[PDB]
Specification:
Chain B: Heterophilic interaction with SREC2 via its extracellular domain. The heterophilic interaction is suppressed by the presence of ligand such as Ac-LDL. Interacts with AVIL. The structure is a homodimer. By secondary structure, chain A is mainly beta. Chain A has no helices and 14 strands. In chain A, β11 and β12 form a beta hairpin. At the A-B interface, β10 of A face β10 of B.
Amino acid sequence: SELDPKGQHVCVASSPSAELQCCAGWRQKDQECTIPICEGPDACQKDEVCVKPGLCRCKPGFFGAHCSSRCPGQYWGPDCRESCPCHPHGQCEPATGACQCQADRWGARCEFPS
Amino acid sequence: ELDPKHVCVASSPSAELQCCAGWRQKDQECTIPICEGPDACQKDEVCVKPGLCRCKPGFFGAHCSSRCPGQYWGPDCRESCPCHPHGQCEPATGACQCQADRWGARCEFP
């Protein structure tokens, strides 16, 4: 896939080819450069994920000093940084946020019974 | 005023001292991280590392309103409390408050 010049963290090589490349600290996904890079002395430890160039946080759905505590149900994402909108009638997939309703609930936020 | 002890030296010919990128002085050294612009810290967050905000000590979660469980202290619960469950740790410093008739740095003695 090729890079969108209007995409996130896309830069231009100042080499004479002047072709599109990810800006420093980012890697390409599809048409933009939205994968942060954590390498060298800032490489992410076990049970951590890279969230910003050179910055790691506990993996999605976990928090704590060893990234081993499970987020309570009202949160998702790394370090529980995201709010789960279907709590308490469901819980959110830790990495995507997608709602998993309890047994007899439905709706985008699990707001409806039966 | 500035101690050459996160202190850097300017690229200019003045060869004067300055805080290294991302840090500010509060006294004689530069140990205040900088959180600015789009990386400014929200309510109940603190800047801990340049361009990084975390929930204030003893709290975590999307609105930094959940209190850490007892085995942790510090911002976003990043620190381990060595005296849990025989004591509790001060959220910002970690200092143990041992339970009744317990002692030691980690409340390890009955």
